[PDB]
Design a protein around this ligand. Sequence first.
Ligand code: ADP
Ligand code: ADP
Lengths: 190, 191, 295, 89, 302
Amino acid sequence: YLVPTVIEQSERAFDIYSRLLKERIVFLVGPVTDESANLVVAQLLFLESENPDKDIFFYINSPGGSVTAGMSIYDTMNFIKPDVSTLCLGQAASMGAFLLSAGEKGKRFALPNSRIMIHQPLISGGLGGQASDIEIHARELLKIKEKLNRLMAKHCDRDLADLERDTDRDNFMSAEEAKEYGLIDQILEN
Amino acid sequence: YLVPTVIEQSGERAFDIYSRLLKERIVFLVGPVTDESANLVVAQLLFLESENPDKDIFFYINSPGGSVTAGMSIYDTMNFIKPDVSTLCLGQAASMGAFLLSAGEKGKRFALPNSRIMIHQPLISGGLGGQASDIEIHARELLKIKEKLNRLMAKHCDRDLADLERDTDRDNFMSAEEAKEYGLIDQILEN
Amino acid sequence: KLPTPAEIVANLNDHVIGQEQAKKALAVSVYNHYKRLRHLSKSNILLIGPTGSGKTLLAQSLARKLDVPFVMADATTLDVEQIITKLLGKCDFDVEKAQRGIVYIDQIDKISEGVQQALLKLIEGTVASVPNVDTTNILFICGGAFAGLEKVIRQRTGGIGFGASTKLFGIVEPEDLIKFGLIPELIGRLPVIATLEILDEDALINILTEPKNALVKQYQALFGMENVELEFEEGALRSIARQAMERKTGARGLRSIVERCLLDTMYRLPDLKGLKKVVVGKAVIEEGREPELVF
Amino acid sequence: QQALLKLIEGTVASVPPQINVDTTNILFICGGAFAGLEKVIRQRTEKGGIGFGASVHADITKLFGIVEPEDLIKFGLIPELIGRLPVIA
Amino acid sequence: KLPTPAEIVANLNDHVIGQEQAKKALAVSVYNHYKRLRHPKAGANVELSKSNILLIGPTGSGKTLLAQSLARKLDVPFVMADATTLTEAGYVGEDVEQIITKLLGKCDFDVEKAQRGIVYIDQIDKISRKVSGEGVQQALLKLIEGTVASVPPFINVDTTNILFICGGAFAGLEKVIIVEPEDLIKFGLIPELIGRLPVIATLEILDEDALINILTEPKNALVKQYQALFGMENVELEFEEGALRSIARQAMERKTGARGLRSIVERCLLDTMYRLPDLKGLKKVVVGKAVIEEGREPELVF
Ligand SMILES: Nc1ncnc2c1ncn2[C@@H]1O[C@H](COP(=O)(O)OP(=O)(O)O)[C@@H](O)[C@H]1O
Ligand SMILES: Nc1ncnc2c1ncn2[C@@H]1O[C@H](COP(=O)(O)OP(=O)(O)O)[C@@H](O)[C@H]1O
C-alpha cells in the first residue's frame, strides 16, 4: 500500500502514521506478530519518553495473534507511566480483545459497530515429537490458558469461573455486550 | 511493516523509531537468531561501545531461538565489550534467546512479569546425512555444543552442570518468577 | 558588627516563607561579601525559581537586614547605569553606601548577547557616572524563571525507555546556564547558585494574612474606609490560594483574585446602608456568589 | 513602553509653562484592540490534537474574557508595564 | 623594557598549570609582536608584518585563560569575541567591525592603544563551511590583516597592528588527522583564513592531576580563596590529599572539568561558612576525603 504523506505546520513531511504517532496514537492492525508487537512496544517506550504524563491512544483492529507477542505489548502497557487508552476499531479478537481489555480502566473504548471476541488460546506451537514432549507443551498451553483467563477476569472485574465458561468457545460480543461484560468502559458515537 | 519516523530535538533529526532507540543504547533482538539478525546486534553492540564504553547497553530480547553460532557471535560480543549489557525479556526468551538473556550482566538481567523463558538442549545444528563417518562427526560436534551450552548456562545461573543437564533435557518452560528462582534473571520489572 | 549567616537567616525567616536552602546560601554569600569589605575574587549570587516564589522579596529583605540601600532592576528593560542612579537615590547619593549596596536584577533568564554584556559591564567592577560609583563592591543578586533549565538537566540525568524522567535545579551547573543561553562570562561572576521552590496553597494563606502588607489587610482597609468590616472565611483563603497556584503565578495571582471576587460588592458598597460587616465565604471566591451582608 | 513606566507609576514630570508635576496620583486608563491576542490565548489554553477526545477547532469574546498577564507578555507588552496595570476589563 | 618570553611564561605559570607548548608559542609571538611594534619605522628599515595565532584545543582546556593571563602582563587592551554572533554584512547579527568597537571601547577610544592591542576570537570551529558560516570567515579575512575600520564612538581604526588569537574546540579535527592546513581545510575553514593565522598553538586536554593542581597551585586557586575567607575568622582551612583527589575525580566523572571545581568546593564548605563566625574556640576546619566523596560533614578541630 502507498502510505500518504502529510505536512505538519510548525514544515515537516510525515507519512500519515508517523504524523499520528506525533499525536500519541499507536495502531495495532492485523495479526499480532513478533515484528508488529515490537513496533507497538517501541512506540509505547518512545511516547513515554516524550511525555510520561500524557495519555497514549492505542487503536486496535486485530484478529489476534501470538500470545508471547501480545504479552510484550501487555507488559509494556502496564509498565510505562502514562495511561494507555485502548480503542476497538472494526474488531478486537483473541489477543486483540485481551489488549483492548488491558487498557487503563475507565479509558477502554469501542466504536459502535465494532466486534469483540474472546476465547481460550489455540496452539501456541505445534505438539509433535514424543508423548513426553506433547505432555510438556500441553501443560504449557494450559498454564497460558489459565494466565489469560485470570488476567481477563481481573480486567473485567469478574470471577475466574466466569471467564473460564465464556472463553470455552469463540464468544462474540457487540460493543454493548463487551461494555456489560467489562471488556470496555465506554462506547463512542461522536 | 512500516517503521514509524520520530523527530529528535537537539535543530531536528528524523529517525526511524529503532534508530531513535539505538541512540538511547537500546538494542533489539526480535524473532529468530540468524547470521544477519545476529550480526546487526553485534554491529550495534560494537557501535555503542565506541559511543560510550562506560554506559550500560540495554538488550531487549523477544526471540524463539535460532542458530547457535549466530547466538554465540552475540554472546562473545556481549562479554567482550567494556560496557555492561543489561538484558530484558519481552514476550519470550527461548533456546538461544534464553541463553542470551542469562548472558546479561549479573544483576542486570530482567524479565517482564508475563514473559515466558524456555531452556532446552540444542536440536540439529545442521543436518546429519552422508556416511556413518560423517554422521559420527556431526553427532560429536552437537554433543560438544550441548555440553558447552549447559556449562555456560550453569555458570550464568550459579547452578551445577548436573542441574542444567537435567533441566534442559526437554523443553523447560518457566515464568519470570521461576526463571528468577532458577538463576536466569535477576529481577522482574513491574513499573 | 556584621551579623553572622545564622543571624541573617534568622531575620530572612521573618519575611520569606519557605526557601530555607536559598536563605542560608544567600546568608553565607552576603556575609562573605561584607566580611571581605571589612578586610581573592568576590562572589555574586543567582536565584533560580518559579514566578511568585519570592526572589525579589528575598533580595529586598537581605538589604534591610544588612543596612544597605537596595535597587530593583530588570534584565528585560534593556541604560543599565540608571540602576545606579536609583541605588544612589535610595541612599541620598552617598556613594559610600551605594558602592556597598545590593542590586537585584530580575528576568535574567529572558535575555538568554548585548544586554548580558551590559549587565556584565556593571557586575565587573566599573565606575558608573550618573547625574561616580565604583561597582566593584556592589553585591548583585540575579534570578529568573529558568523553566527550560529543567530540560537542560533532564537531557543529562530515568532515561527514554523504561524511564520515569527544585529537584534538578539543586544541581544546576554553570554549563547548564550556558546551554540555557547565558554568556559564560556573565555566569563566571555569579558563582553562587540558590534555588527557590513554588509556594503551596497553605503558604499562600500566610501570604494573604500574615505580612504587614498582606492582601487581606489591604482590602480590609478599603472596606474600613466606610463603616464596614471585611472578614474572610478559611475556605475562602484556601480556594483563592489554589486559584493563584493554578495560574503558576504563586503569590502574584492572589491580588488579581481578591480584586475580582470583591469588585461585584465594592461597586454596591457605597449605596448599601446599615451594612456593618461583609463576610467573604469560599462561595464568593469560587462562584458568582454574594458575600454575607450583615445589616 | 519603557518611557511610560515612570509615568504609570509615580515620578515628577517637567513640562513647559503657561512646571514640576507629581504623577503619583494620576490614574491611567490604557486600552487597545489586541488583535493577535486571541491567537496567543488559544495557543495557551486550547488543547487541540488528532484522535478521539482531542479538542477540535473563533469565540473571541470567551478568549478575551480569560486574558491573563501571561498573554499580554507574550503579545508584546513589557512585564513592568503589565504589572502596573492590575485591572483588566 | 619588554618581558622576555621566559618572563611571559613565568606569568602564565602562575595562572595556567599545564599547556606548556602553547605557553611558549603565545609568549614568543607576543614578545615578537611587541618587538615589531617598537621597531623604528623610517627610511629603508624593513617593514615587519605580524604573526597571528590559531589556538586549537579542547573545551575547558584554558584557551581563554591563557589569552587573558597574557594580556594582563602587557597592559594592552584586550577583548574576547565570539565568532558565532557574527553574520554576513547584509544580515541580522553582529558585524566583524563590532570586534574593533569593543577593543576600542576598552581603552576609552584611545586608538593609539586599540591599534596595538590583542583580540581573542573564540568559536572559529563553529563558522566552518559544513550567512552564519563561510560568509563570516570571508568578512574576517580583511579584519585580521590590515584594514581601516569605520568605528562609531566615525573613528578610523587601523587593524594592521592588532594581534589576533583565534581558536576553538576543533574536535572534528582530531578525526580528520600536528594540525596542517590540509586538515583545517577538510574541517571546513577557507585557505584564505588559514593562511592569515600562520602560528598554530595547541592545548592538551585536562586530566585529574591537572584539576588537582588547579585547585591549589595558581595565584587565584580555589583552595587559597577559601583559606582567605576562613582566615578572616582566624580559622585554618585544611584539605586532605584524598579530598583534592575526590574533588578532581567528581569534576571529571560529572564531565564538567575545571569549571566545576568551584561548585564542589562551595558545596562542601557551605555548612561551615554558615556557622564559622559563631564557632568560637575553633582553630581549624578539615575537609577530608569522606567529606567530598560521601554525605559527610566537615571536621571541626577545637
Ligand atoms: N516565599 C515568599 N515568602 C513571602 N512572600 C512571598 C514569597 N514569594 C512571593 N511572595 C510575595 O509576592 C509579593 C509580590 O512580590 P513579587 O515581586 O511578585 O515576587 P517574585 O519575585 O516571586 O515575583 C510580595 O508581597 C511577597 O510577599
Ligand atoms: N590550566 C588552568 N589553570 C587554572 N584554571 C583553568 C586551567 N584550565 C582551565 N581553567 C579554568 O577553566 C575555566 C574556563 O576556561 P576557558 O579557557 O575559557 O575554557 P574554554 O577555552 O573552553 O572556553 C576558567 O575559569 C579557568 O579557571
